[PDB]
Each structure stands twice: as structure tokens, then as C-alpha cells.
């Protein structure tokens, strides 16, 4: 029944919020819909895989909050394999390369590719992390899909193809589904294009030893019986002195404050009294999550390494079920595995098939891309379709269709009386990641601490010391990369000498 704060949702954001409040002396209860904690992170354990992340998995430099929390919980990280060559598969042929970016040899194509990535970052510099709708051209950029932006910027099909894959991979949505403003904000708040796509020195550098699901499981261990599993919240009442929170199985909880630590659209599953303010009421119907199937194919050995391939494949084309892979072998060199994402509309299309049918398609693709018959001999297969999850709605995160961020964005983390909002979608740095979940959870908790007169307003948004274990190298640009003209810029330079 009675406590200081009810946290709705037991993912990383909710658990982190509850941990901070618990550590401050407050009585907290976490209400979780599922029979487990972790939400969009899920570690499966069986004898064939030992452990495997079927949801959120990768951490990297600049993600200092998730690194600190996990370290405090006694977790270790290890480096994702990027010793050997990456592969870019384009028009049925594989091109091995090193470094973060696939190489381009055609000089026109090179100018186009260089200008695209640069423009994304240039446009991002105009967007405040904490308030994207305050960008000078906010409305113009928000009334545009990423597809429209790509059509205007990319003068070659090759750049357009790669930019499209980039959008699909970062936000599990089609370029035509998402707002240009939102996507440009999304990349900037992760530290830019290079940081977001990189393994070494980027978002995919590392995983947790034993899986990322341990983050939530271990906070549950600290909180004990304060975490209530299989308690989906159906009803929040704010008309009286104390807030009343009801669950599906008819339990009632009373608190001074509530943290909502669920994806914004899943707020729709709760009936509110009094009704939500108009803007939030409509916002939560306008913010879907992306579509993805995460698939892991297991092999006897990491045979791609013998061919000097790290296991990273960037795969172009409509025919390919998977557009991106990474080596998912354990740090000890055993349980050899390839992790692949089936993205956006392909997740929808290929969900109709059986498990066995999807395994076949993947093996045949990997055999092609890696040039190895060994890819046709899997020892085990695991997969998870996040689109089917009632209490997630999809993965990785919430995307904003055109027109929404400028109209409703302000409302995302605006408190509704005594309900405060966490969840990775409300973060300002690495929103959509486990990092952002920690940021939002701890910020929401501190908003409540301020409301109770326990901390000054100054202390609601706290910065994070850099990790000593996972330090960040700065992102550099060459002189050529900064000053080489665009395609239309080169063409303008031709029309001027001819006068």
C-alpha cells in the first residue's frame, strides 16, 4: 500500500531512479508489468549460448552514467571484436576495409559522401540537445521526412543508399517515416555521426560480461521485495491528498509522487484521473517505437577471423534480410556467433516466416557476404522480435514522425502534477540507449527530491565524470573533409570559370 514514491516500470530507467531514491532514504516501490525486470534489455541463459543479449547490449565511450552504474553493481565490460577487416557488401560484391567508414573511390561519389556526413553534423550543431524545437529552422526541418532530406542532399545513389541504411540502423525506422529535425537531433545528442556508428571509440565498443540484463537484476537484488513483478499499472488517481496507483491484479498503492519510467506511448495503457492535459493526451498517440528482430547465429569457430574479417558487415540492398552484423563471440574466443539486425520494414516482412526459415536466409546471406561455405553450418540460433512485445511496443526506441517534435516535444518530460517522467526517451544525451535510461531515471528521481525540499534546483541535472576504464578519444576532421566542396558546390565552381 503506502510509500513515498511509486516507480512505474522496472527497466534500466526505473531501476536507476528507484536506486537513487532508496539510497536517499525514501521508501520506494517498483511496479513492473512483466515477470522479469530489464524491459528492452533481456539476457537469455542456456547451455548452448551460456548467455546472450536479445535486446540492448552495447556500451561505449561518453556513456559515462551506464558505465558508472554497472561498475558500482560489480559488472565488467569487454571489447567487441574489431581487430580484422570490416565488410561493405554492395550490389552483390564484398569490399573489405578498415576504420569506421566504408571507402569510396569515385571522386564525385566521394564529394557526395563527404558532404552528406558533414552536413548532418553541421545541421546538428544548430539543434540544442535539451530543446530541439528551439533550433532556428526547427519547423522547416520538422515538416520534412529524412527521405526528403536525403533526396535533396545526396547527388549519387551510392550516398543515398548508405544514408538510408544509416537511418534504418540508428532508429529502426524508414527514412520516410521519421522527421528530419528529430533524426538530426537524435544523432547530435549521441555526439555525432562518427560516435554513433563506430565500434572502436563509439557506441558499439563494448558489452557487459554476463549480459546487460544484470544491471536491472542486480538493482532488484538491492531493492529486495520493493520490486513487484507482474504488476501492470492500469490506473493513476491524483484527485486526493496522496497519489493512488492501481495494478491489473487489483492491488492499490499510495504514494506522494510517481515516476513514469515507460516508453511514452505505453502511457496509453494507463487510465488517468483526472484526464491528462491536452498536449500529453495527444502526444502519447503520436510517438511509435521502431521495428527490429535481433538474431544470433552460432558456429563451431569464428571462422571469419581466419579470412581476416572481424565479423562486421554493412550490407546494402532490398534482398538482404540483415543490413548490419557484429562479431558476438565471447571474450574467451568461444561460443562463436554473428549478431545481425533485421530492420524496420524487413522485420515486418520476415516475421511471417518460421524460425528455421529465417535461419536459412541469414546463413545463405552470411555465406555470400563472408565468402564462406562454413556459414551454412550453424550449431545454434537465437532471435527476438521486439515488435510483438505488449510492454515495449518495439525497439530500440521512440521515433518522431514529421510535425510532432515541434508541436509536442516540450511536453515529453513536463511533470503532470505529481507524476514525473523518466525513460530513455526523455534523456538529453544518448536518448534511446541504456545510457539515456540512467540519465532520465536519476534526473526524474532528483526532480522529486527537489519537490520535497531535499536538494536545491541546481542539483536536478548532474554532470558525469568520464569513465577511467572506457575513456573517450575526441572526434577529429581533416582539412580536406572540412573544405572539399559538395557536388552542387563543385558544379557552381565550374559555372563560374566559364564566365
Ligand X SMILES: *[C]C1=C([C])[C]=C2C(=[C]1)N([C][C]([O])[C]([O])[C]([O])[C]OP([O])(=O)OP([O])(=O)O[C][C]1O[C](N3[C]=NC4=C3N=[C]N=C4[N])[C]([O])[C]1[O])C1=NC(=O)[N]C(=O)C1=N2[C]([O])[C][N]C(=O)C1=[C][C]=C(Cl)[C]=[C]1
- Under the rule (CB under 8 A), what is the footprint of a second copy? 143-145, 147-148, 174, 176-177, 232, 234-235, 248, 250, 265-266, 268-269, 271-272, 275-279, 281-282, 285-289, 291, 345, 348, 351, 385, 387-390, 393-394, 401-404, 407
Which of 197, 215, 337, 343: binder of ligand X (CB under 6 A)? 197
Residue 383 interaction partner, one of a second copy, ligand X, none, beta carbon < 5-8 Å per kind: none
157-171 helix and 146-153 helix, angle to the nearest 10 degrees: 150
Is position 192 an interface residue for ligand X (rule: CB under 6 A)? no
> Which residue's C-alpha cell is 517505437?
289
39: contact with ligand X by CB under 6 A: yes
| Nearer Cβ to a second copy (50/410) | 410
Rule CB under 6 A: say whether 34 interacts with ligand X.
yes
| 191: contact with ligand X by CB under 6 A | no
Distance CA 147, CA 128 (A): 23
- Sign of the C-alpha dihedral computed for residues 412, 415, 421 and 427 taken in this order: positive
Burial letters for 366-399: b for 16+ Cβ neighbours within 10 Å, e otherwise? Answer: bebbbebebbeebebbbbbbbbebebbbbbbbbb
Sign of the four-CA dihedral 68, 475, 100, 179: positive
Look at residues 317, 381, 337, 326 and name the one whose alpha carbon lies nearest to residue 94.
Answer: 317
- The grid coordinates of residue 461 equal 541535472
Q: Which is nearer to ligand X, 195 or 361 (CB)?
A: 195
Q: Which does 235 bind (CB under 5 to 8 A by kind): a second copy, ligand X, none?
A: a second copy
We find the least distance from the C-beta atom of residue 358 to ligand X, in angstroms, to be: 15
| Residue 172 near residue 444 (C-beta atoms within 8 A) | no
CA 38, CA 346: separation in Å to the nearest integer? Answer: 26
Q: Which does 294 bind (CB under 5 to 8 A by kind): a second copy, ligand X, none?
A: ligand X
246: enclosing H helix or E strand = strand 243-247
255-274 positions binding ligand X, by CB under 6 A: 261-263, 266, 269-270
Q: Applying CB under 6 A, what is the total number of residues that bind ligand X?
A: 48
Would you say 180 or 322 has its CB closer to a second copy? 180
Query: What is the nearest approach in angstroms of ligand X to the Cβ of residue 121?
Result: 15
- With CB under 5 to 8 Å by kind, the binding choice for 490 among a second copy, ligand X, none is none
Question: Minimum distance from CB of 349 to ligand X (Å)?
Answer: 17
Q: Which residue in 5, 11, 135, 382 binds ligand X (CB under 6 A)? A: 11
> Which residues, in sequence order, are CB contacts of 329 under 8 Å at separation 6+?
81, 302, 311, 335, 336, 337
Of 422, 420, 470, nearest in space to 450 by CA: 420
Contacted entry of a second copy, ligand X, none for residue 10, CB cut-off 5 to 8 Å set by kind:
ligand X
Cα(108)–Cα(296) distance, integer angstroms: 38
**Under rule CB under 6 A, residue 344 binds ligand X:** no
Amino acid at each position: 500500500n503506502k510509500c513515498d514514491v511509486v516507480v512505474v516500470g522496472g527497466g534500466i530507467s526505473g531501476m536507476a531512479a528507484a536506486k537513487l531514491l532508496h539510497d536517499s532514504g525514501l521508501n520506494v516501490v517498483v511496479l513492473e508489468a512483466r515477470d522479469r525486470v530489464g524491459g528492452r534489455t533481456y539476457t537469455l541463459r542456456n547451455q548452448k549460448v551460456k548467455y546472450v543479449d536479445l535486446g540492448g547490449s552495447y556500451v561505449g565511450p561518453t556513456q559515462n552514467r551506464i558505465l558508472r552504474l554497472a561498475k558500482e553493481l560489480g559488472l565488467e565490460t569487454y571489447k567487441v571484436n574489431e581487430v580484422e577487416r570490416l565488410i561493405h557488401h554492395v550490389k552483390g560484391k564484398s569490399y573489405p576495409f578498415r576504420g569506421p567508414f566504408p571507402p569510396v573511390w569515385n571522386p564525385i561519389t566521394y564529394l557526395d559522401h563527404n558532404n552528406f556526413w558533414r552536413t548532418m553534423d553541421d545541421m546538428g550543431r544548430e539543434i540544442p540537445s535539451d530543446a530541439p524545437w528551439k533550433a532556428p529552422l526547427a519547423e522547416e526541418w520538422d515538416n520534412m521526412t529524412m527521405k526528403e532530406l536525403l533526396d535533396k542532399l545526396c547527388w549519387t545513389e551510392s550516398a543515398k543508399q548508405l544514408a538510408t541504411l544509416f537511418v534504418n540502423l540508428c532508429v529502426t525506422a524508414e527514412t520516410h517515416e521519421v522527421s528530419a529535425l528529430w533524426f538530426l537531433w537524435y544523432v547530435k545528442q549521441c555526439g555525432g555521426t562518427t560516435r554513433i556508428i563506430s565500434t572502436t571509440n563509439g557506441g558499439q565498443e563494448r558489452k557487459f560480461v554476463g549480459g546487460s540484463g544484470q544491471v536491472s537484476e542486480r538493482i532488484m537484488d538491492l531493492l529486495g521485495d520493493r520490486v513487484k513483478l507482474e504488476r501492470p499499472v492500469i490506473y493513476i488517481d491524483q484527485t486526493r491528498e496522496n497519489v493512488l496507483v492501481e495494478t491489473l491484479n487489483h492491488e492499490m498503492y499510495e504514494a506522494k509522487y510517481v515516476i513514469s519510467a515507460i516508453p511514452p506511448t505505453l502511457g496509453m495503457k494507463i487510465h488517468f484521473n483526472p484526464p491528462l492535459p491536452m498536449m500529453r493526451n495527444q502526444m502519447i498517440t503520436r510517438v511509435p517505437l521502431g521495428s527490429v528482430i535481433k538474431c544470433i547465429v552460432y558456429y563451431k569457430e569464428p571462422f571469419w577471423r581466419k579470412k581476416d574479417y572481424c565479423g562486421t558487415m554493412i550490407i546494402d540492398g532490398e534482398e538482404a534480410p540483415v543490413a548490419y552484423t557484429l562479431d558476438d563471440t565471447k571474450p574467451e574466443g568461444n561460443y562463436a556467433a554473428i549478431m545481425g539486425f533485421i530492420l524496420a520494414h524487413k522485420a515486418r516482412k520476415l516475421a511471417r516466416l518460421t524460425k528455421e526459415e529465417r535461419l536459412k536466409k541469414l546463413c545463405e546471406l552470411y555465406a555470400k557476404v563472408l565468402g564462406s561455405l562454413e556459414a551454412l553450418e550453424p550449431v545454434h540460433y537465437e532471435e527476438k522480435n521486439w515488435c510483438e512485445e505488449q510492454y515495449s511496443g518495439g525497439c530500440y526506441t521512440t521515433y518522431f514522425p514529421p510535425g510532432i517534435l515541434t508541436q509536442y516535444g516540450r511536453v515529453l518530460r513536463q511533470p503532470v502534477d505529481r507524476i514525473y517522467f523518466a525513460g530513455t526517451e526523455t534523456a538529453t544525451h544518448w536518448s534511446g540507449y541504456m545510457e539515456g535510461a540512467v540519465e532520465a531515471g536519476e534526473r526524474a528521481a532528483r526532480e522529486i527530491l527537489h519537490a520535497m525540499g531535499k536538494i536545491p534546483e541546481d542539483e536536478i541535472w548532474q554532470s558525469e565524470p568520464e569513465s577511467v576504464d572506457v575513456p573517450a578519444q575526441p572526434i577529429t576532421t581533416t582539412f580536406l573533409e572540412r573544405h572539399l566542396p559538395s557536388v552542387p558546390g563543385l558544379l557552381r565552381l565550374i559555372g563560374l570559370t566559364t564566365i
